From a paper:
Remarkably, the quality control system is equipped with an elaborate backup mechanism employing a molecular ‘gatekeeper’ that can specifically catalyse reglucosylation against incompletely folded glycoproteins as potential substrates, thereby regenerating monoglucosylated glycoforms for their return to the chaperone-assisted folding process. This gatekeeper function is executed by a unique enzyme, UDP-glucose:glycoprotein glucosyltransferase ([name]). Our results reveal that [name] has a modular structure in which the 35-kDa catalytic domain is tethered to the 125-kDa folding-sensor region. The N-terminal folding-sensor region is composed of the four Trx-like domains and the β-domain assembled into the C-shaped structure with structural plasticity harbouring the central cavity displaying hydrophobic patches, which putatively accommodates incompletely folded glycoproteins.
We determined the crystal structure of the N-terminal folding-sensor region of [name] (UGGTN, residues 29–1142) at a 3.1-Å resolution. The overall structure of UGGTN displayed a C-shaped structure containing a large central cavity with 60 × 80 × 120 Å dimensions. The N-terminal Trx1 domain showed a unique Trx-like fold in which the four-helix subdomain was not inserted between β3 and β4 but preceded the α1-helix. In contrast, Trx2 and Trx3 domains exhibited a typical Trx-like fold comprising a four- or three-stranded β-sheet surrounded by six α-helices, in which the four-helix subdomain was inserted between β3 and β4. In the present [name] UGGTN structure, the α6-helix was ordered in the detergent-free condition. The Trx4 domain represented a typical Trx-like fold comprising a four-stranded β-sheet surrounded by six α-helices, which, however, exhibited an unusual topology. Namely, in the four-helix subdomain, one core α-helix and β-strand are encoded by the N-terminal segment (residues 275–410), while three core β-strands and α-helix are encoded by the C-terminal segment (residues 897–950). Such uncommon domain architecture was also observed in the β-rich domain comprising six-stranded β-strands, which are encoded by three discrete segments (residues 29–39, 231–244 and 959–1036). Although we hypothesised that [name] possesses a β-strand-rich domain comprising residues 942–1149 based on the bioinformatic analysis, only the N-terminal subdomain comprising residues 959–1036 gave unambiguous electron density, suggesting motional freedom in this domain. In the central cavity of the UGGTN C-shaped structure, remarkable hydrophobic patches were found, suggesting their possible involvement in folding-sensor function.
Residue numbers in the entry: 29 to 135, 139 to 157, 166 to 250, 283 to 402, 415 to 683, 694 to 737, 742 to 755, 760 to 773, ...
Amino acid sequence: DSSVNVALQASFDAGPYLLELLEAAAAENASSYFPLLDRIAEGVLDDAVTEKELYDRFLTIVQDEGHINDAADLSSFKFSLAIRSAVPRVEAHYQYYNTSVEPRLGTAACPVWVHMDGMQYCSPTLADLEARDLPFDRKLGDPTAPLAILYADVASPAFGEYHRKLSAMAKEGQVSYVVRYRPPPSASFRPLFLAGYGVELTLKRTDYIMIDLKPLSSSEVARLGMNAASFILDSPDPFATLTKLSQDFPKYSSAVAAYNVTQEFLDEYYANRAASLPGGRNVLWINGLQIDSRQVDAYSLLEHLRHERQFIGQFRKLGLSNIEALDLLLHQRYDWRDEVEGGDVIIWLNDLTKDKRYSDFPSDIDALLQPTYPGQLPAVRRDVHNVVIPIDLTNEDDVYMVVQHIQTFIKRLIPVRFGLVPLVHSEPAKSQAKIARYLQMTHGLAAMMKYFQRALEKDKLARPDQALFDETIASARVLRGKAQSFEEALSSTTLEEVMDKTGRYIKRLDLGGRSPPVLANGVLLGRGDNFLQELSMRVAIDLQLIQQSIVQDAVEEDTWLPSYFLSQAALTRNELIMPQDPSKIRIVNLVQVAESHDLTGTNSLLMAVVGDFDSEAGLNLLISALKFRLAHPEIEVVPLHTSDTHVSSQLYQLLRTESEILEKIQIIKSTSLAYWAQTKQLAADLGYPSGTRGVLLNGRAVGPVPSTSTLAEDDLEILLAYEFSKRLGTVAKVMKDLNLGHKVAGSVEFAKLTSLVALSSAIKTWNGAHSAITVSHSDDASINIVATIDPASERSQRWVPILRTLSKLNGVNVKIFLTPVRILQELPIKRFYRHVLEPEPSFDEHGALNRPGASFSRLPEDALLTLGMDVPPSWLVSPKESVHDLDNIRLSSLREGSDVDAIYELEHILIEG
């Protein structure tokens, strides 16, 4: 008889396997690129291009690189070729060149050439589409005004001597150089078979049902899962047992029914409720770090695996063991009321406790129950819900918001109270605000809108004309009017202290600029995003939290309910430093084996105040920073700056003869070598390019922004406190808590460690006695994969081969906890599975790369089986045509010795939009 085979092919076809080498090379350590290229220019792969000489003459080359000749980097790289994937970047260079370059070119005799500022030549002696920094590019030289874009197929000696001393230009320092590859004649491509997918053969009609010819089993099944583990655990070599067992579960089933489950059936069934607390599910960790079941894929794993080894690899800089380091790694509202200065900044359109729209319905709090959503809360005149909407009366969007439906909710008796702060963030936005304020203050409570109503609509609010002003003063319709001013409302009684009073409330709460958030019971709602239903929802959330309060353990009627929301621990400020709307936390370290290493009280945390001293926010940040160094003497600061004058020059001996003294020097300066060389540069690399500014705190970054004291002292240690946080403070208290005096004594090197932890979690895995198929060294595996694998899940079947492939990677521990199901209510794994995934591209040949595939020999006939595919979410794939129904496969009905050689196709993936 014979079998059933499956392979899978990419729609588009690969170029010379050689490129894929190069791009797989920098896939590991990326700096590898050009240096390889430097020497390969000398063509030590320039003899025959058959894949394995250039392959092995390649490996013997890259093992001349410390970048990729680590212990295991070089294994990761093996994997990446058995891993199909260096081609895609290669494919990019092509798709650009085929669509963006060769079309826009016209007419050729020259086969390789560069883009320089215009045209060029087929000779290396030295225009509507420009030299733009494309995604796949690699810059050689530092990136300035000049760019040299080399187009060439790197494979033939034909190219050879362009680069060699176009490798002589940045070298001296002239034009920035980047290499983009050429596509060959369309006849050069040879095909591309893939891996990292799985092949289903599910039992469509079978006797393998519950109550070689064709399996059976009954309701010894809740057991089937149980037992399946001991079964694996009692074989001499268990991991291998694991593998065959999963592969073809349904046929082995009626066997595994009569083999009861062993002693660490249950000392790990309650020992799962201490360590490793999943029961029967599949989760995966890489160094304790859970992976999600949607990236249990070969690709994902690979680039996670090595954006893990270096991060840790980054620790042996300080000289560490790390059987120690990763058991090292283990162990919302804002105040909205304008009170704080003044007491009538905010303009409240609504007032529950006073507006008569909200009639006379009682305030009984405990009568505040059972709502249908035609009515989220009964009508009760309590202060509960408060929404503060910051507005630019210059912004048209804003006004339309309020004039129609801020106005309607009120009107539709919604028990929510609304208010505005007028943004005073432009010469016109204030004036309107001025105007605005002046109406309810003199010409009372409706004129303003019924100004802004008519101002909004057919006039445009872009600027406030008084022509309109005087017309609505005449109106007092709904209104009326005491405290006259009229005219040009240029009063001093307004110009600043409703204005700075609005002015700082804003800047208190950080609401300047283009679009400021919304205050919904203290929680910020981005107005940029839709929010009106999130408003409607964050209320109905916030509602119950109060109902939760009152129903239970609560206060009586003599308490102000919004206190409840507002009573947290978090006061009154910024969305940048503490950016918990975009949870953008920039951590910046690691990478400082730069051209820096400049060296310049116990352990101490570390702050740099990087600035543009000599200017706006220059000293203003710096003085703010310094009154801060006093307030908090814990840390010594190292300021740095970026400009393009002899007035920051005592900055350069703040104390340099061997500070506080200085902290008054610059305030007496406020009204009146090559340090700089590195500062800005080595600033610009921490963000803070070219003048742009903020401060660092021991790995914590900020950035630059709009005004000059937005980064003030108050801000600095609301920064520190939840910078100190459960982040960088605690680092101190887990010390070498574990022991040694310190290998990280310094405050500079402590600064370093604090970064890495902030890059980060799933706290603990433990109890494996002899109830765990271990598959690696527990020691300084500079990778730890733990994973729990249910012997009888379907999900497990992908997982296992991957693990063998992963485990058979060098320096990649893999350990497996069988965690079967309590009581399998039905038959799990009703299919056959094997997985296409090798850890090195293999050969075994007449000389050419192996096309990865599957092979289904030894299957029960007489009954229908279905071939499906198992593969990443992003993959679209079709099966080519055949005499056989690939859904309907009954090996009986067939002819002997012949079989089914199926080949699916990766037709691109998924472009939608």
